[PDB]
Amino acid sequence: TQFQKLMENMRNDIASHPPYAPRRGEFCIAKFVDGEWYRARVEKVESPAKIHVFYIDYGNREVLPSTRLGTLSPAFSTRVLPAQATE
Amino acid sequence: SASYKPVFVTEITDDLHFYVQDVETGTQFQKLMENMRNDIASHPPVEGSYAPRRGEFCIAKFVDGEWYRARVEKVESPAKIHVFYIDYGNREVLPSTRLGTLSPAFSTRVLPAQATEYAFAFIQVPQDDDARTDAVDSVVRDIQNTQCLLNVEHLSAGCPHVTLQFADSKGDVGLGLVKEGLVMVEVRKEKQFQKVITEYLNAQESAKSARLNLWRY
């Protein structure tokens, strides 16, 4: 799928260019508990240790430290492929 | 990726998903239930101080005659209210006379819903109802209402996909279903799953040769 292709490309890029200031509404990459990176949006900033993100392609939500966030490169923005899950 | 968390598996669904509780918070849950059940015994819900609406929390009196935290899903009629037991994962249709108000002392703010839904990584849920029942039955027999180790493998459109390990190093639960011919392998393409997928496909070849279950004919 477009999504699988994008994820492969993005992961490649992150492993070649490993990673940010979280703000409500801002796009990012987020490292999930599987240790892998996904596209996300910052939904709520409760504190540095507690950023509430939404995984824009999968629909899951998670509170995590901002140390597990990074910039989403223009090559993997929502213009390239829209969020695959409904926020 | 390998971070194994001890979980208590509480419910296997007919779609071969399952609900687990984090062993860490088990005692807090235990305390809450005893506190809540004492309250309910002193202050039994009166009809009809509770009006069921989709989305609304409640207490529900389960088939063991005990009360649990729940959330209302479909309301068919006052005799038929669909509820979801938030700490365990099972669902039930009950009359409004077996429901009550969930008082704030025992709310999700005091202690969050304790059950989380997961699916097995690397396998296909059988589409045939009979085959799927056979797979669910194997999982119910082997892990339902027991402690397991859980490792999150990846995100998915629905709940995350995980592997489970039996207690006493008996091995990978999903892989065991493959070895028994009860489920087929989902061939993941991601690089980090190459080795595990090879392991699963080999198990599946073994089930095929032995002509087990799905491979009977």
From Swiss-Prot, chain B:
Domain Tudor intervals: 51-109
Subcellular compartments: Cytoplasm; Nucleus; Melanosome
Positions of modified residues (Phosphothreonine): 101
Tissue specificity annotation: Ubiquitously expressed.
Changes after translation: Phosphorylated by PIM1 in vitro.
Positions bearing Phosphoserine: 103, 107
Role noted for this protein: Endonuclease that mediates miRNA decay of both protein-free and AGO2-loaded miRNAs. As part of its function in miRNA decay, regulates mRNAs involved in G1-to-S phase transition. Functions as a bridging factor between STAT6 and the basal transcription factor. Plays a role in PIM1 regulation of MYB activity. Functions as a transcriptional coactivator for STAT5.
Quaternary structure and interacting proteins, as annotated: Forms a ternary complex with STAT6 and POLR2A. Associates with the RNA-induced silencing complex (RISC). Interacts with the RISC components AGO2, FMR1 and TNRC6A. Interacts with GTF2E1 and GTF2E2. Interacts with PIM1. Interacts with STAT5. Interacts with SYT11 (via C2 2 domain); the interaction with SYT11 is direct.
Protein name: Staphylococcal nuclease domain-containing protein 1
